Each structure stands twice: as structure tokens, then as C-alpha cells.
Amino acid sequence: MNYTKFDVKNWVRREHFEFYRHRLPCGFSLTSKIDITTLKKSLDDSAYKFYPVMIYLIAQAVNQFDELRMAIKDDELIVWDSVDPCFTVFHQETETFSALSCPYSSDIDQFMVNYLSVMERYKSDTKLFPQGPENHLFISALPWVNFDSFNLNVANFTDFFAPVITMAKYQQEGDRLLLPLSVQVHHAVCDGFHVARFINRLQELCNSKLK
Amino acid sequence: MNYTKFDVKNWVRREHFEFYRHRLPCGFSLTSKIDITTLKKSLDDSAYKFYPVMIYLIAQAVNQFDELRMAIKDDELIVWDSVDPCFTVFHQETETFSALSCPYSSDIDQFMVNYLSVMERYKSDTKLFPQGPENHLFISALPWVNFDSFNLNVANFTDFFAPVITMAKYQQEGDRLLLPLSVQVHHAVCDGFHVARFINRLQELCNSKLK
Amino acid sequence: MNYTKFDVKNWVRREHFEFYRHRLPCGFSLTSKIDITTLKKSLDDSAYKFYPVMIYLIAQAVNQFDELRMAIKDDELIVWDSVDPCFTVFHQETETFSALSCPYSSDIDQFMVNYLSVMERYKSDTKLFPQGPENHLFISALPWVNFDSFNLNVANFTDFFAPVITMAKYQQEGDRLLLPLSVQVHHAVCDGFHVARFINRLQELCNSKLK
Ligand SMILES: CC(=O)O[C@H]1C[C@@]2(C)[C@@H](C[C@@H](O)[C@H]3[C@@]4(C)CC[C@@H](O)[C@@H](C)[C@@H]4CC[C@@]32C)/C1=C(\CCC=C(C)C)C(=O)O
Ligand SMILES: CC(=O)O[C@H]1C[C@@]2(C)[C@@H](C[C@@H](O)[C@H]3[C@@]4(C)CC[C@@H](O)[C@@H](C)[C@@H]4CC[C@@]32C)/C1=C(\CCC=C(C)C)C(=O)O
Numbered sequence: 007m008n009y010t011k012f013d014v015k016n017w018v019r020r021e022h023f024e025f026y027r028h029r030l031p032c033g034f035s036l037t038s039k040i041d042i043t044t045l046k047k048s049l050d051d052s053a054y055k056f057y058p059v060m061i062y063l064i065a066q067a068v069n070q071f072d073e074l075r076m077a078i079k080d081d082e083l084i085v086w087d088s089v090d091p092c093f094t095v096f097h098q099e100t101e102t103f104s105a106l107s108c109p110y111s112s113d114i115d116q117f118m119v120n121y122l123s124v125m126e127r128y129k130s131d132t133k134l135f136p137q138g139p140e141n142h143l144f145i146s147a148l149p150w151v152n153f154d155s156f157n158l159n160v161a162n163f164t165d166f167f168a169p170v171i172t173m174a175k176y177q178q179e180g181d182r183l184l185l186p187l188s189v190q191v192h193h194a195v196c197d198g199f200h201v202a203r204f205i206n207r208l209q210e211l212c213n214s215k216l217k
Numbered sequence: 218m219n220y221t222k223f224d225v226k227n228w229v230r231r232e233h234f235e236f237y238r239h240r241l242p243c244g245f246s247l248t249s250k251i252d253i254t255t256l257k258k259s260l261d262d263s264a265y266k267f268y269p270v271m272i273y274l275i276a277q278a279v280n281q282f283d284e285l286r287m288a289i290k291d292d293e294l295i296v297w298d299s300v301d302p303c304f305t306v307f308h309q310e311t312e313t314f315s316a317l318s319c320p321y322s323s324d325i326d327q328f329m330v331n332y333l334s335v336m337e338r339y340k341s342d343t344k345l346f347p348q349g350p351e352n353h354l355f356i357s358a359l360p361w362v363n364f365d366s367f368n369l370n371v372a373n374f375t376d377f378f379a380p381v382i383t384m385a386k387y388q389q390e391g392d393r394l395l396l397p398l399s400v401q402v403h404h405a406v407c408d409g410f411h412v413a414r415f416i417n418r419l420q421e422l423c424n425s426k427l428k
Numbered sequence: 429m430n431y432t433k434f435d436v437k438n439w440v441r442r443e444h445f446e447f448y449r450h451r452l453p454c455g456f457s458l459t460s461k462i463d464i465t466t467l468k469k470s471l472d473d474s475a476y477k478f479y480p481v482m483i484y485l486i487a488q489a490v491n492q493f494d495e496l497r498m499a500i501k502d503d504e505l506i507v508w509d510s511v512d513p514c515f516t517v518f519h520q521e522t523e524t525f526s527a528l529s530c531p532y533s534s535d536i537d538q539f540m541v542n543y544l545s546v547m548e549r550y551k552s553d554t555k556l557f558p559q560g561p562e563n564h565l566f567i568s569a570l571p572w573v574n575f576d577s578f579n580l581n582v583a584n585f586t587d588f589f590a591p592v593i594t595m596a597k598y599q600q601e602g603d604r605l606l607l608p609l610s611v612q613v614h615h616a617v618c619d620g621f622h623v624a625r626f627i628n629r630l631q632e633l634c635n636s637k638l639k
């Protein structure tokens with residue numbers, strides 16, 4: 007299948023996992039600013055647009071860490087071999103959003119192809135889920151406003167291990183262009199170290215060649 | 218009455234409403250900084266004080282968007298024709314706060330009259346609710362400290378649709394005076410677009426003549 | 429014993445306490461930046477390290493306010509005469525953390541002695557709680573990344589009154605070195621005033637001689 011069962015008994019975090027999954031169930035969010043000064047430059051020298059590029063880079067970073075691709079399947083802890091991004095699309099006409107997903111691909115060009123293709127087919131579709139699989143990552147965008155913090159207050163997040171990432175409008179801060187990015191995870195599968203690792207990797211990706 | 222029943226069946230967000238009200242119940246908070254450089258100037262040229270003015274302007278912006286004045290009445294979705302601000306009052310003597318409300322009025326002078334009047338009558342009243350109706354907005358102030366984020370962790374927010382707004386101590390950031398403002402809403406009636414719209418409108422109001 | 433039963437009937441906040449403990453159960457978090465420009469200087473002129481010093485100063489500030497040392501014992505409201513810090517320790521080897529506590533002491537040198545001693549004995553211990561009493565404060569550190577906000581989403585926090593403090597990586601902001609610090613408390617025992625008071629006291633402590 008496209009997932010492997012995780013060896014929970016020999017895992018270094020097995021105590022932590024039981025602890026934060028059942029003893030003291032919790033998750034946390036954190037908002038940090040990513041420096042997109044370099045990325046903006048690379049975007050400027052290309053035909054790629056900002057949203058699709060950030061989706062790609064967030065999916066890329068996620069795809070690099072097992073702890074960000076865990077799930078409960080058949081009451082067992084698994085790791086997805088790979089996850090596809092699920093992202094929000096605003097409909098200016100109805101002022102409502104939809105959620106769409108498209109297959110992740112390590113080739114940025116093939117990813118762009120997938121993205122346009124999905125966007126092509128459902129741009130007009132106002133259902134909440136126009137498409138109607140489980141190895142996903144959630145990405146949302148609030149481009150109309152800058153924020154220093156964002157937190158989702160969910161009534162029930164039992165065994166909800168997929169990361170939720172929210173980005174705000176970027177802004178010029180001195181000489182840098184900063185993007186606020188909120189990350190919300192479940193404490194059973196992710197510690198603060200794990201989140202900081204993801205953010206630092208994303209920052210390095212933004213600071214690198216697209217191709 | 219002072220409210221209208223909302224047409225949920227022909228609403229563009231009907232799916233979203235059921236989704237975030239019962240399928241996946243949730244709300245979110247966001248903190249953004251409002252630029253009060255201009256407002257400070259207008260305040261300086263007037264006899265109005267800061268708190269009462271912000272309450273007025275927050276109530277004014279709210280009063281402009283239906284999605285911020287929704288409620289459940291008799292198991293039905295309604296919109297208040299208008300909401301009155303409910304705001305916190307600190308008692309230096311007991312170091313405790315109270316919550317008071319006063320009628321909103323589009324005339325800033327008449328609003329000030331209402332405010333002083335309520336403050337006059339209960340300044341000495343240490344009960345939590347000295348006054349003892351439901352079309353409200355909640356406004357709170359933390360003037361003693363600056364914050365970049367604020368979030369309320371509520372054990373049960375079922376059908377709780379009124380916005381909660383928290384403001385921190387403002388501060389000088391370069392050439393601007395910024396005020397941190399947290400907004401917490403229920404995802405059944407408000408999307409990120411809706412919150413960004415409110416904040417942008419508030420910013421425009423701060424940047425405009427008081428009268 | 430090391431705690432006193434609190435006089436809830438003659439307390440100015442008795443209504444607030446019942447209100448936020450049972451009527452509308454809630455807590456809140458807030459992230460603010462502390463200016464550690466001065467502290468860094470004092471650290472530079474000493475042999476003390478950053479983490480142990482912040483733990484000491486956070487415990488010191490806490491130890492100064494009753495509202496931050498409340499608990500439910502035998503279904504009664506009590507105040508701890510003093511609380512000891514419980515702080516996280518990262519294991520680079522396993523990339524996992526542990527929680528340790530050590531006795532608080534108003535003498536910074538004796539505190540350092542306690543700290544080293546605990547760290548000495550369990551540096552190698554990967555259990556979640558290597559040590560296996562209740563008058564504590566929770567301190568956590570995310571030194572690998574800067575954040576503007578941090579919030580813990582806990583499924584059940586009934587009667588959980590001990591403060592939770594999270595610090596991020598500090599950073600240079602103009603001429604100042606700022607440290608992001610998140611504070612999460614229960615609204616039954618703490619108001620926004622109470623949190624601002626703690627943060628302002630901490631800022632003053634950072635800005636003062638160590639000894
Ligand atoms: C795990 C879970 O409960 O996910 C639910 C919950 C879900 C993750 C949803 C997709 C999407 O709305 C998510 C966003 C980011 C949508 C936009 C914002 O409003 C966020 C506040 C929001 C939080 C969670 C939410 C609402 C879900 C799905 C979608 C499945 C896959 C596809 C392509 C539709 C799900 O059930 O699988
Ligand atoms: C909807 C609901 O549950 O509101 C409850 C909950 C309520 C909104 C309350 C008014 C006021 O404390 C609110 C503030 C901002 C008070 C100050 C802070 O501590 C906030 C953390 C807090 C959150 C919600 C709270 C505590 C309520 C009222 C008040 C009704 C109207 C008037 C004039 C008193 C209510 O029940 O109607």
C-alpha cells in the first residue's frame with residue numbers, strides 16, 4: 007500500500023505518544039515569520055505564481071519528515087509514504103471557499119501541471135469539497151490581511167494528526183519581506199522540536215533554487 | 218423585532234455553516250496590528266478618550282457586517298439589526314473587572330453620552346454584570362501590556378457566534394503607533410475572509426475623521 | 429503544611445472564580461516579547477547560562493503572586509506557599525524531551541546548585557518524568573525557532589490552575605534582543621491584569637542585578 011505500519015514499541019517517543027494521545031490529549035499552534043525575500047526574487051525571474059509555489063514547498067518539507075505524515079488506520083499507527091496538499095480556493099463571486107487537493111510531485115513542473123489542472127476543472131465549483139483519499143496535508147491562505155498569530159479552536163481533534171498550516175498576507179519589514187505562517191499539530195506525534203525542524207527546513211527551501 | 222430570520226437554504230455558505238457548526242465544530246482567533254498613528258492625532262485634537270472611541274469604532278465596523286451579528290434564536294439562524302458593545306471595566310480598588318454594555322449609536326456624540334452615563338452609574342459596582350439583552354459584541358482591554366497574540370481556550374462554545382475582540386497596550390514601532398487586536402469567531406458564521414474584511418474596515422475607520 | 433486554604437467567601441473575585449471555573453470554563457494564552465538586552469549583559473559578566481537563569485527568574489516572579497500558585501486540594505481552593513519549576517530537557521541523542529523539577533530557592537547560587545544536581549543525575553534519562561509533588565510551575569523551551577505566538581489546545585483542563593510558560597529562540601530586533609514568551613492560564617484564578625502584572629514583573633527582574 008502507500009503507507010507503512012509504525013513500530014510503536016521500539017519508538018523512542020512511545021511514552022510521549024500514549025501520554026499526549028490519551029492521558030493528556032493536546033495539540034498546539036505556533037506562528038513564526040518566514041523570510042521570503044529570496045523566494046520573491048526567484049518568483050520574479052520565473053512564470054510561477056506565489057500560492058502554488060508555497061503549496062509545493064510546504065508539501066515538499068512535510069514529505070521529508072515522518073512525524074508529519076502519521077495517521078491512525080485500523081486502530082494502528084501508520085506513516086504515509088507521501089501526502090498530497092489539500093488547499094483552500096476563494097471564489098470572489100460568492101465570497102466563499104472550497105478545498106481542493108492535487109497529487110504532490112518532487113518535480114516542480116509536474117506539480118504545476120497538476121495544480122492548474124485541478125484549478126481548471128473546479129474553479130467554478132462552489133461545493134466545500136468539489137472532488138468528494140486520506141494522505142493529506144491542510145494548507146490555508148488568508149491573503150487579505152497580515153496576522154502575528156492564528157489558532158484553530160476545535161471541539162474534538164481525537165487522533166487528528168495531519169498538520170494544519172495557515173499563511174497570512176506577507177509584508178515588508180525593513181529590508182525583508184516576511185510571511186506569517188501558523189502551524190497546528192497534535193502533541194501525540196509532534197514535539198516543539200519537530201515543528202521548529204519543519205519551519206527551519208521550509209526557510210531553507212525558500213532560500214534555494216526552485217529548479 | 219430587532220432581528221430577522223436568516224435564509225439558510227438559499228445562502229451561499231449553507232454547506233459551510235452545517236459543516237463547522239456540527240460536523241467539525243470550530244472557531245479560530247487571529248491577532249493583527251492596527252495602525253493608530255492617524256487616530257491618535259484625531260484624538261489629540263478632541264476631547265474624546267481612547268477606550269470609548271475604540272469601542273465605538275469596533276461596534277461601528279461590526280454593525281456593518283451581517284456575519285458578525287448572527288445568533289441562534291429558537292433553534293433558528295438570525296441576524297441582529299444592530300448589536301451593542303459589552304466591554305470590560307477595571308476597578309483599580311479591587312483589581313477586578315466588570316462587564317458593562319451601552320446602546321450603540323451611529324452618532325459618536327450620542328454614543329459618548331451613553332458610555333459616560335453607564336460608567337457614571339456603575340463605576341463603583343464590583344459585580345461581574347452590574348446591569349444583569351442578547352444582541353451584543355464582546356470587547357476586552359489589556360492596557361497594561363503589549364501582546365503579539367491572544368487566544369481564549371473555551372471548554373464549550375456551541376452556537377456561540379458573537380465575536381470576541383481583545384486589544385493590548387499600543388506601542389511605537391518605528392514611525393507608527395500600533396495596536397494589537399485579537400479577534401475570535403466561530404467558523405460556522407465566519408471565514409478568514411470575513412475576519413480580514415472586518416479588520417481592514419476597522420483600519421479604514423481609524424484612518425478617517427471622527428465626525 | 430506548605431499551602432494555606434484560600435478564603436473564597438471574602439475574596440473580591442469570588443463571583444469570577446465560580447463563573448470561569450463552572451459556568452463558562454476557560455483559559456487563555458498570550459505571547460509578549462520580553463527585552464533581554466540587559467540580562468544578556470549580566471549573563472556575559474557571569475558564569476551563569478541562559479536557560480537556568482530564565483527558569484530561576486520565571487519561578488521568582490511566580491513565587492511573588494498568589495494567583496499563580498492556586499490549586500484544588502481535597503475539593504478546596506488553596507495557595508502553595510512556594511512552587512518549584514518543572515522544565516523541559518531535550519535529549520539530542522533521541523531527539524526527545526523529558527520534564528524535570530528542582531527546588532526553588534531565593535538564593536540564585538543555591539538554585540544553580542539544585543539545577544546542576546538534577547541535570548547531573550538525569551541527563552541520560554529518557555523517561556518522560558525521570559523523577560516520578562504537586563506545587564509546580566511548567567516551563568518549556570523551543571530554542572530552535574522564533575515564534576510570535578504559541579497556544580496549547582488541551583481537550584480537558586478542568587481545575588488545572590498552574591501556569592504554563594513557553595519561551596522561543598530570542599532575536600535581535602533593532603537595538604534590542606527580544607525573547608518571545610507565551611503564558612497560558614486558567615481564567616478562574618487569573619485575569620488579564622494578573623498576567624500583565626507577571627510579565628511586567630519578569631521584565632523588571634531581567635533588567636536588574638542577578639545578585
Ligand atoms: C481530518 C479531518 O477531519 O479533516 C476535515 C477537516 C479539515 C481538515 C477538512 C479540510 C479543510 O476544510 C480543513 C481547513 C484547513 C479548511 C479551511 C479552514 O476553514 C480551516 C479552519 C480548516 C480546518 C480543518 C479542515 C476543515 C477535512 C477533511 C478533508 C479531506 C480531503 C479532502 C480533499 C476534502 C477530512 O475530513 O478528511
Ligand atoms: C454568550 C455567552 O456565553 O456570553 C457570556 C461569556 C462572555 C461573552 C460574557 C461577557 C464577558 O464576560 C465575556 C469576556 C469578554 C469578559 C472578559 C474576559 O474574561 C473574556 C475572556 C470574556 C470572554 C467571554 C465572556 C465571559 C457573557 C455574557 C454576557 C451578556 C451580556 C451582558 C451585558 C452581561 C452572556 O452569557 O451573554
Ligand SMILES: CC(=O)O[C@H]1C[C@@]2(C)[C@@H](C[C@@H](O)[C@H]3[C@@]4(C)CC[C@@H](O)[C@@H](C)[C@@H]4CC[C@@]32C)/C1=C(\CCC=C(C)C)C(=O)O
Pocket residue numbers: 030193514516527528529557559560561564566567568580588590592
Ligand atoms: C497538572 C497536569 O496535568 O500536569 C501534567 C501536564 C503537564 C503539566 C505535565 C508536565 C509537562 O509534561 C507539561 C508540558 C509543559 C511539557 C512540555 C510540552 O509538551 C507542554 C505542551 C506541556 C504541557 C503540560 C504538561 C504536559 C504534568 C504533570 C507533571 C507533574 C510534575 C512533575 C515533575 C513531572 C502533572 O500531571 O502533574
Ligand SMILES: [Co+2]
Pocket residue numbers: 024028029
Ligand atoms: Co491509551
Ligand SMILES: [Co+2]
Pocket residue numbers: 069087
Ligand atoms: Co520520501
Ligand SMILES: [Co+2]
Pocket residue numbers: 235239240
Ligand atoms: Co446538523
Ligand SMILES: [Co+2]
Pocket residue numbers: 280298
Ligand atoms: Co445597519
Ligand SMILES: [Co+2]
Pocket residue numbers: 446450451
Ligand atoms: Co459551581
Ligand SMILES: [Co+2]
Pocket residue numbers: 491509
Ligand atoms: Co513568599
